[PDB]
């Protein structure tokens, strides 16, 4: 498969230097992380000032060309409450610095489009939310339990889009009608998964050759029990050990979201997995649970 995992160690927060935490990750060249002195090795190690722009380049800019490429593609953000991963697929939304994955994706997808001749593009986006194994739309609140079907989500959403602008206004539509019959927020987001799905149809106008890649930007639920892991997260480790295991059989149907993202997670979709980490001493146990689901992707 072309499963990559990296993993990104964000900085210590306030609250943990606040208590006497200190900063037990190590540093073993740039694809090796050392803790307790077990080496955990990943297709790239992040430290914790890595900046948001080589994150996009390493994790996701050679995808974005594979889709435009007409492949389909997924990219993940797993980890522990507070670890970074909506920083990591989000960040601050509008900031040319503090911009995260998905409006880098956006800005690129575009930076293409417009720099064609003959060819013609539809990209449309939806944006919907799992939570206790449901789907509902975050762009209309009325349709809260989505089901899968032979792969597609009946009813979702879908909303043509003609420039980066227009992706933005819908991803900020969507974070605010996810507050929606929510008490609270915060809780809630780390106890689900949101996913960005962006379509990308190319026509060439003069050879009528057709192209579609789709990329699914995924921000899962949190990693740590709430008393059992999170159905979406078993399945998806069951699915990664399977394709890592190069099964001819994997267990898509172990979730509905590993069912909708079953034609751009193995195979030949091409995936990244951001793993992310707290450096503190106090999440000692959690972050090797965290490269621990990470390492599930190395080939055996
Ligand atoms: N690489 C980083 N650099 C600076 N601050 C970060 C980084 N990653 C996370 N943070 C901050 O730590 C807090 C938790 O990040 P967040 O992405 O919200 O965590 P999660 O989505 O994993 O629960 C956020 O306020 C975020 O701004
Ligand atoms: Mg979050």
Redesign the pocket.
């Known amino acids: 498969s072309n499963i990559k995992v990296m993993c990104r160690f ?2 210590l ?1 306030e609250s943990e230097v606040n208590r006497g935490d200190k900063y037990i990750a190590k540093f073993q060249g740039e694809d090796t992380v050392v803790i307790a002195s077990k080496p955990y090795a990943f297709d790239r190690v992040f430290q914790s000032s890595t900046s948001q722009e080589q994150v996009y380049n390493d994790a996701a800019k050679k995808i974005v060309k594979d889709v435009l490429e007409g492949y389909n593609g997924t990219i993940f953000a797993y ?1 522990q ?8 697929m989000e960040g601050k939304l509008h900031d040319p610095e503090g911009m995260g994955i998905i409006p880098r994706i956006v800005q690129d997808i575009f930076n293409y489009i417009y720099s064609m001749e003959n060819l013609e593009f539809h990209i449309k986006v939806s944006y919907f939310e799992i939570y206790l194994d449901k789907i509902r739309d975050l762009l209309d609140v009325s349709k809260t339990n989505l089901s899968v079907h032979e792969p597609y989500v009946k009813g979702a959403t879908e909303r043509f889009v003609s420039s980066p602008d227009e992706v933005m206004d819908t991803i900020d539509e969507g974070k605010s009608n996810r507050h929606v019959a929510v008490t609270n927020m915060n809780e809630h987001s ?1 106890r689900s998964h949101s996913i960005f799905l962006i379509n990308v149809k190319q026509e060439n106008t003069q050879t009528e050759q057709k192209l579609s890649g789709k990329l699914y930007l995924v921000d899962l639920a ?1 990693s740590e029990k709430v008393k059992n892991i999170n159905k979406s997260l078993s399945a998806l480790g069951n699915v990664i050990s399977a394709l890592a295991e190069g099964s001819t059989y994997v267990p898509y149907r172990d979730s509905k979201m590993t069912r909708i993202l079953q034609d751009s997670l193995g195979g030949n979709a091409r995936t990244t997995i951001v793993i ?1 980490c707290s450096p503190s001493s106090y999440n000692e146990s959690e972050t090797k649970s965290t490269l621990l689901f990470g390492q599930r992707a190395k080939t055996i």
């Open positions: 964000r900085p927060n980890g409450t507070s670890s970074g991963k909506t920083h990591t780390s949190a992310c």
